[PDB]
Amino acid sequence: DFSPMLTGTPPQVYNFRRLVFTDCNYNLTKLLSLFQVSEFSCHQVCPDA
Amino acid sequence: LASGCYSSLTVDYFAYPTSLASYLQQGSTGEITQYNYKQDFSNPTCRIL
Ligand SMILES: *[C@@H]1O[C@H](CO)[C@@H](O[C@@H]2O[C@H](CO)[C@@H](O)[C@H](O)[C@H]2NC(C)=O)[C@H](O)[C@H]1NC(C)=O
Ligand SMILES: CCCCC/C=C\C/C=C\CCCCCCCC(=O)O
């Protein structure tokens, strides 16, 4: 369920919302199509993995 | 590269906006890496925008 991430007004940095997902299947292609990534930096993993 | 010699030099160039500069990164999973261009890391290489 990514609807709370994509439905309301986003919160501010101090009031960040957290979503934890277990046992589910998500469409990563749709989420990457919704947003335009400006920069990213990953630790001990890469987004292709 | 300025102060040296190499035996060969392969240059791949294309028209590419700087707003999509994150999609050309090392571990990116965007449309560019999956369908357009995958950089090869087997020789010393540079990526210049
Ligand atoms: C993930 O979401 C995308 C939409 O962003 C789905 O792609 C659509 O799939 C339907 C059914 O085949 C097509 O009629 C649409 O034309 C597709 N749209 C786009 C923009 O590709 C995709 O099927 C979803 N992934 C899965 C596994 O269902
Ligand atoms: C930007 C939408 C973020 C959605 C977050 C929810 C799930 C994402 C899970 C893994 C993120 C992998 C993609 C990281 C960015 C790739 C950069 C690019 O595309 O070059």
Q: What is the DSSP string of B1-49?
A: --S---S----------GGGGGGGSSS--SHIIIII-----SS------
| Cα–Cα distance measured from residue B20 to residue A48, given in angstroms and rounded to the nearest whole number | 17
The three-class DSSP label of residue A37 is: coil
Nearest CA to ligand 2 atom 10: A47
Whether the Cβ atoms of residue A24 and residue A38 lie closer than 8 Å to each other: no
Spatial separation of the C-alpha atoms in residues B22 and B42, rounded to whole Å: 21
Closest alpha carbon within chain A to B27? A46
- Contact between A41 and B28 under an 8 Å Cβ cutoff? The reply is no
Quote the CA–CA distance of B49 and B24 in Å, as a whole number: 10
- CB spacing of A46 vs B27 below 8 angstroms: yes
What experimental approach yielded this model?
cryo-EM
